Amino acid sequence: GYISIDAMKKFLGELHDFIPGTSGYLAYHVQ
Amino acid sequence: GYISIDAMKKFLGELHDFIPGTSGYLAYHVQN
Amino acid sequence: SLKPFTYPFPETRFLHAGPNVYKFKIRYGENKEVITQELEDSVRVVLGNLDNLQPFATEHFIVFPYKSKWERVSHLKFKHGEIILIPYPFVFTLYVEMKW
Amino acid sequence: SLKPFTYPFPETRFLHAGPNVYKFKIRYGNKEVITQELEDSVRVVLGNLDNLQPFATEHFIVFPYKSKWERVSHLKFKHGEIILIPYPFVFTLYVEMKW
């Protein structure tokens, strides 16, 4: 028996896919 | 799929059941 | 609001929530709208229980969440326009199995 | 090396390895082979204490989880005169049928 998803806390805020090159998203790396 | 148990690192040392009152095992707890 | 989840194929997704970006990995063992919604719910649950991951059952699945160190995350910078997004330093792997 | 595990019923087992004692909990959902592969799963968990991941045995999928061992600072373990150090986390192995 596992806990039901409905018995758990859920983040209810806005949630977006982070896709660089879209919606103003960008990602970098050290060099 | 899932990784096979045979591909995992394994602890190969001695492994015993810890049963207080046997084989010299003992356990304690704080008290007021 | 999110791209459709890949029901049969394992995938990696970067998610922007609040001030953070999270790295998620989905692994798999008819009405696909419900399936996508419950997978989004599973992600939202993991985000709501960042420090107390435990397996849980949806209407159709058992989700086994795992957290691992996001290596070389200190060498990355994420931005939304001029906003700096804070990467959560752990990667979440969701093993999704069927609720029989 | 350990007594057989209770295949159908959930159980808690305290195991002595090296200088330490670990708290394991087994939850479910020829028993000699089952006991042997469960011992192997325990040894794998001990070999990957910091990088827990699910793995498949011949008959099961094992989902290991770590949780804080509460109220363990108030415990002292000994083997004879030797002081055993309790590993401060409890390991719960969710065992599921591989098929």
Author numbering:
A (entry chain D): 175 to 205
B (entry chain B): 175 to 206
C (entry chain C): 2 to 30, 39 to 109
D (entry chain A): 2 to 30, 40 to 109
Per the authors:
In mammals, meiotic telomere attachments are achieved by a meiosis-specific complex of MAJIN, TERB1 and TERB2 (herein referred to as the meiotic telomere complex) that repurposes and integrates the functions of two complexes, LINC and shelterin, which otherwise perform distinct critical roles outwith meiosis. Here, we report the crystal structure of the MAJIN–TERB2 complex, revealing a 2:2 heterotetramer in which two TERB2 chains wrap around a core MAJIN globular dimer.
The N-terminal structural core of MAJIN (amino acids 1–112) was recombinantly co-expressed with the C-terminus of TERB2 (amino acids 168–220), yielding a co-purifying equimolar complex. Both structures are essentially the same and the subsequent discussion is based on the latter higher resolution crystal form. Size exclusion chromatography small-angle X-ray scattering (SEC-SAXS) revealed scattering curves and ab initio envelopes that closely match the heterotetrameric crystal structure for the truncated construct, with the wider complex demonstrating an elongation consistent with its additional sequence being largely unstructured in solution. The C-terminal end of TERB2 includes five highly conserved basic residues within a seven amino acids stretch (amino acids 214–220); this region is unstructured in the selenomethionine structure (in which they are included) and is essential for DNA-binding by MAJIN–TERB2. The MAJIN–TERB2 structure shows an extensive basic patch on the surface of each protomer, formed of highly conserved amino acids in the grasping β-sheet of MAJIN, suggesting that it may mediate direct DNA-binding through electrostatic interaction with the phosphodiester backbone.
